[PDB]
Amino acid sequence: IIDDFKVAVVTQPLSENKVQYNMVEEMAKEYEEENKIDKTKVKQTIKHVVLPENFTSNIDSAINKIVKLADDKEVQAIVVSTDQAGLLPALQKVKEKRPEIITISAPMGDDKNQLSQFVDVNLGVSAEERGKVLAERSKEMGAKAFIHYASTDDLKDVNIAKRLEMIKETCKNIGLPFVQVNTPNINTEEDKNKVKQFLNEDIEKQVKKYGKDINVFGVNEYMDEVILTKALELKYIVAEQSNPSPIQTYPSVMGLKISEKDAQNYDKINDMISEKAKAFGMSNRLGGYPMPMDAFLPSLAIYLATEMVKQDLTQEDVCDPDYLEAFTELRFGIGSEFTPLTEVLYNYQSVILSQLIY
Numbered sequence: 001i002i003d004d005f006k007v008a009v010v011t012q013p014l015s016e017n018k019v020q021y022n023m024v025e026e027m028a029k030e031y032e033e034e035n036k037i038d039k040t041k042v043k044q045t046i047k048h049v050v051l052p053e054n055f056t057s058n059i060d061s062a063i064n065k066i067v068k069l070a071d072d073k074e075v076q077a078i079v080v081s082t083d084q085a086g087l088l089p090a091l092q093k094v095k096e097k098r099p100e101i102i103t104i105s106a107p108m109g110d111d112k113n114q115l116s117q118f119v120d121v122n123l124g125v126s127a128e129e130r131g132k133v134l135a136e137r138s139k140e141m142g143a144k145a146f147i148h149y150a151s152t153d154d155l156k157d158v159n160i161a162k163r164l165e166m167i168k169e170t171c172k173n174i175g176l177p178f179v180q181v182n183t184p185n186i187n188t189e190e191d192k193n194k195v196k197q198f199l200n201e202d203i204e205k206q207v208k209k210y211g212k213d214i215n216v217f218g219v220n221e222y223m224d225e226v227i228l229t230k231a232l233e234l235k236y237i238v239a240e241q242s243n244p245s246p247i248q249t250y251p252s253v254m255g256l257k258i259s260e261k262d263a264q265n266y267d268k269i270n271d272m273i274s275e276k277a278k279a280f281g282m283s284n285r286l287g288g289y290p291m292p293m294d295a296f297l298p299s300l301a302i303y304l305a306t307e308m309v310k311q312d313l314t315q316e317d318v319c320d321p322d323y324l325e326a327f328t329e330l331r332f333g334i335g336s337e338f339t340p341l342t343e344v345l346y347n348y349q350s351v352i353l354s355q356l357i358y
Contacts, residue, residue, distance in 0.1 A: 002309065002312075003042075003074070005043075005044055006044070006045055006075045007047070007076070008049055009046055009047065010066055010082075011049075011081050012051050019247065020298055021050075022264055024302075027299060028045070031044055031046055044306050047072075049069065055084070056084055062086070067097075075101065076309045077104065078094060080106065081106050081301070083107060088108065088114060088115065091118060102309065104122070104305055105123065105124070113341075120315045121315055121319060121347060122349065125351065127166070129350060131166030132167075134240055135167045135174065137239045137355055138239040141239055143176060143237055143239070146167065146176055147179045147181060148164060149216070149218040149227075154220070179206065181202055183198055183223070195222065200226065200230060216230075216237070217238070217239070225252070228286075232280055239287045244289040244293070247264075247266070254273055255276065256272050256276065266295070286357070289353040289354070290353060296332075299332075300327075300328065300332075304318060304327065319347040325337065325338055339351075
């Protein structure tokens, strides 16, 4: 009989990462409800650990906060979810004190090779593979050109650069004209309205050149807003936001009001977006995923940790694309594709979710 256990989940605070924070809280409540039904079931709860604000500037307090979890005898797994780097030493120290604690990045911002060496299960996104799939999904939706918008400062970000490179290469392989357009650098808030004006004028130009069957893509939520808004008028294609999310940007663009209680009900949000898309003459023009990656990775990691503790599994048992795809169908009812970092670094798996078209 496996002891009742805790799955500790580390996120940034609500003020910084609302989606991650609230998904963990939601899963906590789910597990509380499960624990009310006696049959005998093993009991699991989530311990939500909140990092200090601006944690990279308060790195020792953030690290210490995690390492203390090792003192709690009931903690049997630790999941860490942040796009930022710095917390890896914390998980090394936990593992040295408590070898049996299952550690999972979902995601972490640290070097991916280091993550593979020192953390048991690693889940993330590959900018390269994202680029390839976004180019293909654009093609499948009937795009006759792909317009990519980003500032030269944006292109300093290694993942933005890498995704761009793979979109361009993929577009070349599949005969999709690719157009790269440099947007003004955003150094102050004043620059935002300059970016908005720039985008509006350039998009009009691109539609005059190619006609409306082009895909338009930007690299942040502010661009996504301008792009989706203009799409309603010119009726072009937006295969994906910078990062696909039903809850970010879509609700304001489509004129939806999502209650605090529905904020994590992604299926209901998606139905609401499709109704508006139908009403606005935009069916089969707008895409995404069934849920944002900021919600999926930590929710998948929690379910995996729980299964691993209940079934006494280790990284070798679960870190396999077929296993993780089937488990995703089981727990979410969605399709996915998982790819190892390298054939040898099997315990780092990147994921792309199946397409949703509104």
